[PDB]
Design a protein around this ligand. Sequence first.
Ligand SMILES: Nc1nc2c(ncn2[C@@H]2O[C@@H]3COP(=O)(O)O[C@H]4[C@@H](O)[C@H](n5cnc6c(=O)[nH]c(N)nc65)O[C@@H]4COP(=O)(O)O[C@H]3[C@H]2O)c(=O)[nH]1
Ligand SMILES: Nc1nc2c(ncn2[C@@H]2O[C@@H]3COP(=O)(O)O[C@H]4[C@@H](O)[C@H](n5cnc6c(=O)[nH]c(N)nc65)O[C@@H]4COP(=O)(O)O[C@H]3[C@H]2O)c(=O)[nH]1
Ligand SMILES: Nc1nc2c(ncn2[C@@H]2O[C@@H]3COP(=O)(O)O[C@H]4[C@@H](O)[C@H](n5cnc6c(=O)[nH]c(N)nc65)O[C@@H]4COP(=O)(O)O[C@H]3[C@H]2O)c(=O)[nH]1
Ligand SMILES: Nc1nc2c(ncn2[C@@H]2O[C@@H]3COP(=O)(O)O[C@H]4[C@@H](O)[C@H](n5cnc6c(=O)[nH]c(N)nc65)O[C@@H]4COP(=O)(O)O[C@H]3[C@H]2O)c(=O)[nH]1
Lengths: 109, 109
Amino acid sequence: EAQRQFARVKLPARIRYIGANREGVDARLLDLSAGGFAFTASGAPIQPGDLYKGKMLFQVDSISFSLEVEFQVRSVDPASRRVGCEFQNLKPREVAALRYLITSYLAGE
Amino acid sequence: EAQRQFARVKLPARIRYIGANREGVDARLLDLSAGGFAFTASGAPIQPGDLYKGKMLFQVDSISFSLEVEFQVRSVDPASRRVGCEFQNLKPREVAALRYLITSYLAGE
Ligand SMILES: Nc1nc2c(ncn2[C@@H]2O[C@@H]3COP(=O)(O)O[C@H]4[C@@H](O)[C@H](n5cnc6c(=O)[nH]c(N)nc65)O[C@@H]4COP(=O)(O)O[C@H]3[C@H]2O)c(=O)[nH]1
Ligand SMILES: Nc1nc2c(ncn2[C@@H]2O[C@@H]3COP(=O)(O)O[C@H]4[C@@H](O)[C@H](n5cnc6c(=O)[nH]c(N)nc65)O[C@@H]4COP(=O)(O)O[C@H]3[C@H]2O)c(=O)[nH]1
Ligand SMILES: Nc1nc2c(ncn2[C@@H]2O[C@@H]3COP(=O)(O)O[C@H]4[C@@H](O)[C@H](n5cnc6c(=O)[nH]c(N)nc65)O[C@@H]4COP(=O)(O)O[C@H]3[C@H]2O)c(=O)[nH]1
Ligand SMILES: Nc1nc2c(ncn2[C@@H]2O[C@@H]3COP(=O)(O)O[C@H]4[C@@H](O)[C@H](n5cnc6c(=O)[nH]c(N)nc65)O[C@@H]4COP(=O)(O)O[C@H]3[C@H]2O)c(=O)[nH]1
């Protein structure tokens, strides 16, 4: 097994992006980390390697955070339709902020 | 002069609350800190000591943050209509998160 570079957490979170068939997607996140996220595809075709841009929202410490993110699909389980994604081109302070907030959430667990 | 307990910054930020005359307010923030904020009243009556609840939005490191805050008016300059406010009842992790983000903004300056 591989070490995950960023700890993952399950919290209230959502991704909104425009997908392949020009069909807007609104998906609850299965989990989130400073490196990426997962969600259940339940819809249009999606492939490993696909690049999307969207607005991600999540809540930590009663604060709602949202940012525009680009992501790359890293895996698609054709069975469960679980889609694993990696953020692309996040700025240093942005990644740092994500890490801080997720760590703060973890601290609460 | 008095030392400010929390550093203040000028960033894109907004407060939305329901004011005295039941008149909804949407005001850009003059500045923000982990302790409170200021805005120009330009409208209905408002007094030192007034308590309001609203949704505050601000942007740091390309991330948009919003939270429901209760605030107490600490000062009202009847001339410039500058209103200075103090957050009430923020949770420890919430204050810590605010301090972190504002410090991160300051670091960028
Ligand atoms: N390609 C890919 N798929 C991912 C990734 N994260 C989650 N998944 C998929 O999501 C399933 C379940 O993830 P899990 O709940 O965290 O639960 C996982 C996890 O807790 C653990 N696990 C398995 N392999 C690894 C690993 O290489 N590293 C770590 N840290 N945990 C693993 O075993 C459970 C299931 O393993 P899987 O059969 O692989 O089944 C995984 C896998 O199909 C990922 O970064 N890349
Ligand atoms: N929150 C979240 N982020 C995701 C997910 N899928 C991909 N990412 C993000 O994209 C990076 C690369 O994913 P990977 O190519 O599948 O490459 C993964 C994968 O090969 C493996 N891995 C980690 N966990 C599992 C697992 O539960 N099952 C399996 N089969 N592999 C895993 O370890 C590699 C690196 O893991 P990371 O360091 O965490 O790095 C991940 C992670 O930052 C996801 O389901 N949830
Ligand atoms: N009651 C109250 N009013 C506030 C507060 N913060 C800002 N104001 C009001 O906003 C005006 C300008 O604030 P400033 O731009 O930061 O610019 C300020 C600030 O840079 C500085 N200053 C004056 N007094 C103090 C002080 O006691 N502590 C600090 N740290 N700075 C002060 O002088 C400028 C103007 O002084 P002011 O005449 O008082 O005029 C102040 C004052 O009327 C506050 O925490 N409480
Ligand atoms: N971002 C922001 N927060 C505000 C403002 N007004 C009040 N607050 C928040 O509410 C606390 C108390 O404000 P104060 O009663 O006016 O009590 C103030 C006030 O008496 C004085 N003070 C600070 N700056 C100034 C200033 O520029 N001018 C004057 N006249 N007094 C100041 O120092 C006391 C404590 O300052 P703080 O520690 O900063 O603590 C402030 C601050 O956390 C504001 O305009 N902007």
